[PDB]
Amino acid sequence: ALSINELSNLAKGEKANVLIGQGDVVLVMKRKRDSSILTDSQTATKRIRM
Amino acid sequence: IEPFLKTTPRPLKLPDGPPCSQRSKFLLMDALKLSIEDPGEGIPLYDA
Amino acid sequence: IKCMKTFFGWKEPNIVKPHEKGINPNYLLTWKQVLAELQDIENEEKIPKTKNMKKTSQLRWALGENMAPEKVDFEDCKDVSDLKQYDSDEPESRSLASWIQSE
Amino acid sequence: YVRTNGTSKIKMKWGMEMRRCLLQSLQQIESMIEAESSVKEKDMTKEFFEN
Amino acid sequence: MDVNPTLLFLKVPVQNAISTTFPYTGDPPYSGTGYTMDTVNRTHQYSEKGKWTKNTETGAPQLNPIDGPLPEDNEPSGYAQTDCVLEAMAFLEESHPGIFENSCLETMEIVQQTRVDKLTQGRQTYDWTLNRNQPAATALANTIEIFRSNGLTANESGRLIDFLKDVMESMDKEEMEITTHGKKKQRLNKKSYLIRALTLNTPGMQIRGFVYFVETLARSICEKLEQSGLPVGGNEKKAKLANVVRKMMTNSQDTELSFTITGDNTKWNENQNPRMFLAMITYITRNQPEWFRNVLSIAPIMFSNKMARLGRGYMFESKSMKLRTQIPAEMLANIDLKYFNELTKKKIEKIRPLLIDGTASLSPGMMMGMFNMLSTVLGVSILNLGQKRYTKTTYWWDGLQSSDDFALIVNAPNHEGIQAGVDRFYRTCKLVGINMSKKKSYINRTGTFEFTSFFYRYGFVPSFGVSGINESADMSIGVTVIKNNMINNDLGPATAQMALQLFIKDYRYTYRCHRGDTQIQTRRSFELEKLWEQTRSKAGLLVSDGGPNLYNIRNLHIPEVCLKWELMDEDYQGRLCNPLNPFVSHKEIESVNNAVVSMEYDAVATTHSWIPKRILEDEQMYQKCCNLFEKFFPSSSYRRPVGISSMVEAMVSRARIDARIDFESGRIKKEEFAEIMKICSTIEELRRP
Amino acid sequence: MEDFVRQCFNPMIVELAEKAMKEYGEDPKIETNKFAAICTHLEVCFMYSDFH
Amino acid sequence: GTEPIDNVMGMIGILPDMTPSTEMSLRGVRVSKMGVDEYSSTERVVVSIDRFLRVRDQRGNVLLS
Amino acid sequence: LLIAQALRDNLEPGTFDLGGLYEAIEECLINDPWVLLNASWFNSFLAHALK
Amino acid sequence: MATKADYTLDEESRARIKTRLFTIRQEMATRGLWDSFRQSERGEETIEEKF
Amino acid sequence: MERIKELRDLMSQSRTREILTKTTVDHMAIIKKYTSGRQEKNPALRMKWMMAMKYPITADKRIIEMIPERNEQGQTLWSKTNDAGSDRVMVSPLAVTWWNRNGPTTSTVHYPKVYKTYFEKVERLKHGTFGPVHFRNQVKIRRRVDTNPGHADLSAKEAQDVIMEVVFPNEVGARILTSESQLTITKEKKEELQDCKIAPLMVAYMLERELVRKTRFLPVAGGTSSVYIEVLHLTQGTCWEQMYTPGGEVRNDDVDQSLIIAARNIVRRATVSADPLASLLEMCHSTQIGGIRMVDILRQNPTEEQAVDICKAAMGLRISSSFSFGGFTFKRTSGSSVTKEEEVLTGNLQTLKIRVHEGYEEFTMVGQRATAILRKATRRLIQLI
Amino acid sequence: GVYINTALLNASCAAMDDFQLIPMISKCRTKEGRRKTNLYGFIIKGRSHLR
Secondary structure, eight states: OBOTTGGGSOOSSOEEEEEOSSSOEEEEEOOSSOOOSSHHHHHHHHHHTO | OEEOOTTOOOOOOOOOSSOOOOOOSSOSSSOOOEEEOOOOTTOHHHHO | OTTGGGOOOOOOOOOSSOOSSSOHHHHHHHHHHHHHHHHHHHHSSSOOSSOOOOOOHHHHHHTTTTTSOOOOOTTTTSSOTTOOOTTSSOOOOOOOOTHHHHO | OOOOOOOOHHHHHHHTTHHHHHHHHHHHHHHHHHHHHHHHTSOOHHHHHHO | OOOOGGGGGGTSOGGGGGGGGOOOSSOOSOOOHHHHHHHHHHHHHTTOSSEEEEOTTTOOEEEEOTTOOOOOSSSOOOOOOHHHHHHHHHHHHHHSTTSHHHHHHHHHHHHHHOBGGGGTSSSOEEETTTTEEEOHHHHHHHHHHHHHHHTOOGGGGOBHHHHHHHHHHHTTOSEEEEEEOOOEEEEEEHHHHHHHHSOOOOOOTTSTTHHHHHHHHHHHHHHHOSSBOTTOOTTTHHHHHHHHHHHHSSOSSTTOBOOBOOBOBTTTTTSOOHHHHHHHHHHHSOSSOHHHHSSSSSHHHHHTTOOOBOOSBOOOOOTTTOOOOOOBGGGGSSSOGGGSOHHHHHHHHHHTTTOBTTBOOOOSOOOSSSSTTHHHHHHHHHHHTTSSSSSOSSOOOBOOBSSSOBOOBOOBSSHHHHHHHHHHHHHHHHHHTOOBOTTTOOOBOTTEEEETTEEEESSBOOOOSOOSSOSTTTTTHHHHHHHHHHHSSOOOHHHHHHHHHHHHHHHHHHTTOOOSSSOOOOTTHHHHHHHHHHOSOSTTSOSSSSOOOOOSSTTSSSOHHHHTSTTSOHHHHHHHTOTTOSSOOOOOSTTSSEEOOOEEOOOOOOTTOOEEOOOOSOTTHHHHHHHHHHHHOGGGTTSOOOOSSBHHHHHHHHHHHHHHHHHTTTSSTTHHHHHHHHHHHHHHHHHOO | OHHHHHHHSOHHHHHHHHHHHHHHTOOTTTOOHHHHHHHHHHHHHHHHHSOO | OEEEOOOOSSOOEEOTTSOEESSEEETTBOOOSSOOOOOSOOOEEOOOOOTTSOBOOTTOOOSBO | OHHHHHHHTTOOOEESOHHHHHHHHHTTOSSOHHHHHHHHHHHHHHHHHTO | OOGGGOOOSOHHHHHHHHHHHHHHHHHHHTTTOHHHHHHTEETTEEOOOOO | OHHHHHHHHHHHSTTHHHHHHHSBGGGGTTTTTOOOSOOOSSHHHHHHHHTTSSOOEEEOTTHHHHSOSBOTTOOBOBOOOOOSSSSOEEEOTHHHHHHHHSSOOOOOSSHHHHTHHHHHHHHHHTTOEEEEEEOSOOOOBOOOOBOOSSOTTOOSSHHHHHHHHHTOGGGOOHHHHTOOOOOSHHHHHHHHTSSOOSOHHHHHHHHHHHTOOOBOOOOBOSOOSSSTTTTHHHHBOSSOEEEEEOOSOOOOTTHHHHHHHHHHHHHHHHHTSSOHHHHHHHHHHHOEETTEEHHHHHHHOOOOOHHHHHHHHHTTOOEESOEEETTEEEEEEEEOOBOOEEEEEOTTSOEEEEEOOBSOEEEEEEOSSOOOEEEEETTEEEEEO | OHHHHHHHHHHHHHOTTSOOEEEEEEEEEOTTSOEEEEEEEEEEOOOOOOO
C-alpha cells in the first residue's frame, strides 16, 4: 500500500492501492473523462419520467 | 384574593430568650491593633 | 450616469493607502454604496434629478457627523483634565516638497 | 480574647471574597447613578458625589 | 444614628435596588436519610385516597391517585384527572396546529442518530453494578461490561436505542451475574435485579436513555411554544416577559383590568404523577410509528415503579462510651425502635410498610429533574386554556411558565372578573395536578412583577476570580466574563473596571505573578525578578509573568498574547511561543479552549497553557486503545474517524506503510525495519483466531 | 435518515422511489430504510445503464 | 379613525398623520417605546411545493407565492 | 418587601395567604445576631413606609 | 461479484459506481446512520426499526 | 517502533484484544468517551489549594534534559513523581518562568497568520475611532446577529473537509479524493501553513474557529454588523452609547445577492417551461455562481429570499416556516388560519378575489428597520404594536 | 478577613501536621502616606489533614 501523498506519482490511468482515510486500504485509479453529475444523470432519470 | 391594605402589615415577632452572643471568626470592633511604621521583608513573623 | 456607463473596468475596491488617522472601512463602503445608489437610479423610471443618499452609519462616520464633539456648558466639564484652549499650540512646521511645484 | 474555633476549605475560599463584597456595593451605587443619568440625559456622577 | 440600610427603599423603588436584597455574591459555605424519609412520606400523604396495589414484578406496594376523588380543601393534592390532562393537551394542539406531529419528526432524527456516548455526558449517577454513586462514563462502562458478560451485546452497534433494547432484554433475564475485581462473582435474582434497576438515589444508568428521549421531545415542543421559557436563557427570557406584558397591558379599551399573579407552585415535584406523563406522551405521539411510542413511553412507565433508596442511615451514640455507629438504611425495616427519637419514630413507623429490602416505593411522585421540561408543557397547557375561546366569558389570561415559575396575567373587565379568573385558573390547575402556592404568590395590577429572579418594573432590572485551569486560560476566562456580564447582565463600566482590578489581584495572589518591581516575596519571586531585568521593553511581559496590565474596557475581548505582541521582545516571543514546550498539553479538540467552569475562551497556547495535577479489570483499557490509535492516526483527536476496518487492522496497516516509506528514506536503519515488519506479522497472526 | 436521503439523492430518483413505494402502499416517511434502499437501487441501475 | 389611550406604562400613540400623541392613537396601533424584541428561532420545516411555484404547506397556507 | 412596595405604588396588591408568608419569614429567625438585626430593620421599614 | 466472473462493463464504469457507493457509505456513517442501515437488511428485504 | 510494541503488548493480553479487534474504526469515538475519574467540582478552590503546595503543574518527561533541576539560587524547578499514572513529571511553576527567561528561543512568523482570528481583532481595535458618549435612554432590541467577522462563509461540515486537507493531508477520506471540489482557501492555507510546527490539533482548531459563522441573539441597539458585535460591551450600555468604529476590513455580501438573482431567473424560466422540476434541478446542478456550482451555494448559505427559498424547496431542503411579505418576515407564534379565497368589491366597485385568512393568529413581524407584534382575527386587526 | 484566611490556607497546605503560629497581620497606608503594619492577634493552626 501507499500513502495519500505518494499517489501524486501516477499516470492518467495507473492503478495503485492506497491507505484511504483512517484505516482501510482501497485500490484506486485516476479517472478518464470528467465524470460529473451534470445533465447526463438527469437524462437517465428524466427520460423515464415521461 | 384578600386585599393588602396599609393596615394589613404586622411587625415580625422576633424570638425570645437569652441575648445573642457573637460568633464571628475574629473580633470586629473590640479589636486592639499593635501598629508599626515599617516603610519589612514581607514576612509575618518579622512584623509580629 | 451616462458618463459612468462609459467605463467597463470596475473592479472590487481595494484600499491602497489608508488615511492613517481616520476611518478607512467607512470610506470604502461609502463608495460601494454610491455605486449601489447609482444602480438604483438606473433601475427606477426617470431620473430623480436629486438622489438623497440613505443615511447609514457608513456615511455618518465618513462625513464626521459621528466624530464631532458635543457641546457642554463649562459648569459640567470643569473637572475633566483634558480641557485646553482650542488651537492651544499646533503650528507644526512642514518643509517644502516638490509636488506643489509639479502642480 | 481566646477561643477555639474551626474552619474548612470552603469557608476559607468564602472568606477570600470580601473584595467581591466590595464589587456588590459598587454595583448597586453605579446602578443608581446610571438610572438617574438616563433620566436626566447626562452624567450625574459628579452631581451625586460632590453636590 | 442607628444605621438601617433597608430604609433606603423609602426613596429608591425596591426593584431598582434589589441587589442589596441578595445577601450572598457566590456560593454559601454551609449546606440525610431523614429528608428522604420526609419526602417519601409527604408524597403518600398527598395521595391518601388512592388505590393501594402490589406491583407483581418488583413486589412493591404502589399508590395510584390518578382519577381520584376531587380535592375538598386548599391543601396540596395530586388527584389529577386523565380526562382533564388529555383535554388540555388537545386544546393546546388545536391552538398550535401540528405541534406534536411536527416535533415528533424532529425527535425521530435524534432517536436514531444518537450514539451510546450520550449516557456519559452528565453528572454523577447511581451505578446498579456496585450500589454506589460513580461517574457517568465509568458507570456506563461497568454496565456495558456486565451486559457483555451476561450475553447482552447488542450495544455494540454504537446506537443508543440498541443499548435500550439491551437493557430491556436484561429486564427479562432470570439471573444477572456480576463479576467484581479479589475476583468474586455474585448472582442477582430477577426480582433483586429489578429493584436495583428501578432505583433513584439521594436514578440508575438504565433510565438515562429513555428520560433523554422524553426530555428532548419536551424540549422540541417547548421551543415552539412562546409561553414556555425553560429551553432558553438570559436574553430570551427577557423578551418573552416584555412581549407578554406589552401584549396584555395595552388593552384596546380602559374597561380591561389587568392583574399579574407572580407566584410559584408548592410541592411541584411531589404531585406531578408519572402516570400523568405517560398519559400525555401517548397523546403527543399519535399516528406515529409504533416503535416511536414504545421508546418515549418507557421512562414514565419506569418512573411510576421507582424504588427510591433511603440513603446512609442514622448514627447512634452513647454519652458514656462516646461510641458512634451508622445503622445502615437496610436494617431500618427490621430493628427495634427504642433507640430512635420521637420524630424519627413517627417517620420510620409511617414509612415502614413502603420499605422493600431497604428501598422505598415512591410511586405517586416524580423526583427533581426527570421531565423538568415535560412538566413545563403541562403547565403551559393551562396557560393556554385562557385564550378567550375556551373561557367563553369576559376574562382571559396568559403568561409564562418555567417549571414552577409562572407570571400569569388575568385580564378582565372588573375586580369580580379578575377574582373569578384567578379562581378558575387555580381550580383548573388543581384538576390537572398543579398545586399553586398561596404562601408565595401575590397578585398586583400589571406594571411590576417577578419571574424566576427577573424583576420587571416598567423595564427589566459568583463568576469573578480565577477559574483555576491554567495561567493563560484564566486571564482569558475572567476577562471574557467581565464582558459577557457587561453585555448581558447590565454590569456597568465602573463596576467592570473594579471587577477587572479585583480579578487581577486574585490572579496575582493565586499564581504568585506579582510584578517584578514590587517586592512581595514568594517562591516565584526570584525568577520573575530576573525576568524583570533582562527585558528591554516591560509592557510586553504577560501578567502571568512579572508584567503590567493593559486591559481596560476597550480590549476586554482581545486575548492577552495578541494584546502584548508589538510590545513584546523577540528573545521573549521565541521562548514564550515555542511549540516545543514541555508544558503545552492538549489531546482533544473538545478541550482546546473549552473549560467546564463549558465556556468558549480565547488563548494563544503559550508556555502558560500547562495542565494541573490530579467492574472493569483495567479502567484505562479504552483509554489505552484510544491513545494508541491517536498515536497511529493523529487526526483521531480532531475528527471522529470513519472507516470499515477494525482498529487493529488499520493500525497494523499504517505501521507497515510508515516503516516502508521510512526505510526507503533511510531514517529507520534497516535492522529496525525488519523487526517492525516481523512484529506486525506476529500481531496479524494473533488476530487470526 | 430521510433528510440525508433527500440531501444526497437527487429529486428525480426521489420521486421515482416515491411512486415505487406508492405502488405498494408504503409510507415514504414511516418507512425510510426501504426508501433509501430503493433510491440506491435506482441510482446504481441508472449509473449502470448510462454512459454506454 | 382614532381612539383614546390610557398611557399604560409609557406607550406613545401614533396619529393618522404619523405623529406622536399621548392620548389619541390609531385603532389597534400602539407604537411601543423601549423597543419590541425579535425572535430567537426560525422553525425550519419541509414544505410541499405545487406545480406553479406556490409554496404551500402540509397545513395549506401559502408562504411565498 | 415586594408586596409592600407594590402597595406603595397604588397597584392594589393582593395575596392568597399572608399568614403563611409571615410564618415562613418567622421560621428562620431563631438564634442569629445578623438575622435578628435584619428582622428589626425590616420591622422599622414597615413602620415607616406603609404606616 | 457477478455470474461466471463476468462483468459486462469497462473497468472505469464499474469504478464510477463503486466509488459512489463508498462515498455514500462514508457520508452515511459520519452521520451515525450507517450502523442502523446495515442491520436493516435481511435476505433481500429491508425490515423496519422495531422496538 | 515503540508504538508497534505498545500495540503488540496490548494484544498479548486477551481482554483488550476484543476491544481492539471488534471495534470498527467507526466505533472509536464512542470508545474514546469511556473516561475514568470524577473531573473536579469547584476547580478554583482546587487551584488555590494546588498553588500553595509545590510541584503543581505536570509536564512531559523532557524538562529533565532541557531544564536544570535547580536555578541559580537553589530552587527545585521540577520533581520526579509521575503524576497519578503517566510519564508526566510534576513541576513547580518556577519552571515556566525559567523557560520564559533562560529558554530555547525561536522565530515566530507562523503565529501572526495561524492565529489570524485574534491579530485581526488587535489590528481592528488599534485603528478604531471613538466618539462622544451620549447618555440618552438607550433602547436595546434583541437581534440575532453574526459574531465572527471574516468567517469565510463556510458551514460547519465543509470546514472539516478543509481542515483535513490542510493539516492532515495523509488522512483525507474517500469523499474528498474522489471529488472535484478543491476550494480556493484550501490552496492558500496549504501554502501558508507549509512548515508550521505549532500544534496540528491547535492549527485545526484555529482554522475551524476562523472558517465558521455563529449567532448569539444579543441585545443590540445599532450597528448590527459582524464587527460591531464583538465590541458590543464598549459601544452600548444600559444608559450610555459610546460611538465607535472598528477600523479593519469588511465582508462583501455579494455572493448572496448573486444567488438571489440566479434563483429568480431560474425559477422564471423553469415555470415558463413544460416540466418545471426538471428545469429547476438541472439548472441548479449545472448553473454556477462565480465558478462555484449553485448546489454547493444552496447547501452552504443561509440566505433567506423568496427565489432562493423556492430553489431550495424544489431541492428538498428545509425552509423557514416564516413567510415574507412586504419585506417583513412574519413568524407565527400561535393560532391557525385557512386561505379561503372569497370575493369582495373594492372602493371603485371592482370585483376582487382575495384569500380571506380565516382564523385568529399572532405574528412577529420582524424586519430590517422595524419590528412589531400583530395579533388578528378573521377581518379583525385585534392588536398591532 | 481575606489576609487571615489566605495565610491560614497557605499554612494548612504547607504544614499538615504542625501547629504553625499564624499572626493576624494587616497593612494600611496612613493618612500621611507612610505604610503601616498592624498586628491584631495570633492564630495557632491545628492538624490540617484536609481530604
